[PDB]
Amino acid sequence: AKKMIPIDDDKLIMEFKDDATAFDGTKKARFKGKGWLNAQLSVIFFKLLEEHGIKTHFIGVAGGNRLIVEKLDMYPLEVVVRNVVAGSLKKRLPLPEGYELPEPIVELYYKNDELHDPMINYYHAKVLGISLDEIKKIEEIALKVNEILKDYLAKKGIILVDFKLEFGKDKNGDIVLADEISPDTCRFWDAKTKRSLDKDVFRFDKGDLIEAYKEIYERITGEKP
């Protein structure tokens, strides 16, 4: 769903593609316009977060589906924040889809193809070279990101169910939010109907992906795509 093109030493191009995959890449389709939607929405979220004092890798836009971002030394993690029970969480807790959590859950996943991104804890992370201090800073940022995104979306009648973040280290050794934030990497439910406005539409054939992504875009920006 994304291509990364180096520029110099400091920055690279992050290009969003129309490709979609699910179930460990076993399900595939292409959706015209998805790259554009995901690019734009990432820009809006990064800008929101930056205003709130979150260090992100966003530098600028390079026309269309491409963003200019800061090159980072990436942590091999997917950091998942969860507010409402959905997806894989139903296999860890005996709780129904839609259950409102008493407080957010943060999950760590090790980004590894050989192993299919297994869940890990702080101890595995330490073995992978990530200190407890670093994990703690990462979860602190993720939880702050959760607060900002969920408040901002709740005002627009969207429940932030759960979402995935990734992080890297900059040249000062600061922890910087990286990758993307889009309906590919979040669960968004309509506050009223509880219906998915995200990649779950493609994952489980809940309707047309592009329509759902357009709706999200419109409900956030007030403008048509």
Ligand X SMILES: N[C@@H](CC(=O)O)C(=O)O
Ligand Y SMILES: Nc1ncnc2c1ncn2[C@@H]1O[C@H](COP(=O)(O)OP(=O)(O)O)[C@@H](O)[C@H]1O
Indicate whether 206 belongs to the interface with its own copies (CB under 8 A). Answer: no
Indicate whether 185 belongs to the interface with ligand TMP (CB under 6 A). Answer: yes
Sequential DSSP letters for the chain: -EEEEE-SSSEEEEEE-SEEEETTTTEEEE-TTHHHHHHHHHHHHHHHHHHTT--BSEEEE-STTEEEEE--EE-SEEEEEEEE--GGGGGTSS--TTPEEEEEEEEEEE--TTTTS-EE-HHHHHHTT--HHHHHHHHHHHHHHHHHHHHHHHTTTEEEEEEEE-EEE-TTS-EEE-S--STTTEEEEETTT--B-STHHHHTT-S-HHHHHHHHHHHHHSS--
Count the residues of the shown chain that bind ligand TMP, applying the rule CB under 6 A. Answer: 11
Indicate whether 21 belongs to the interface with ligand X (CB under 6 A). Answer: yes
Options 37, 81, 142, 178; binder of ligand Y; rule CB under 6 A: 178
- Minimum distance, C-beta of residue 64 to ligand X, in the bound complex (Å): 23
Options 47, 50, 60, 123; binder of its own copies; rule CB under 8 A: 123
Indicate whether 121 belongs to the interface with its own copies (CB under 8 A). Answer: yes
Catalog residues that contact ligand Y under the rule CB under 6 A.
1-2, 4, 57, 69-72, 74, 166, 168, 178-179
Catalog residues that contact its own copies under the rule CB under 8 A.
91-95, 101-108, 110, 112, 114-115, 118-121, 123-124, 126-128
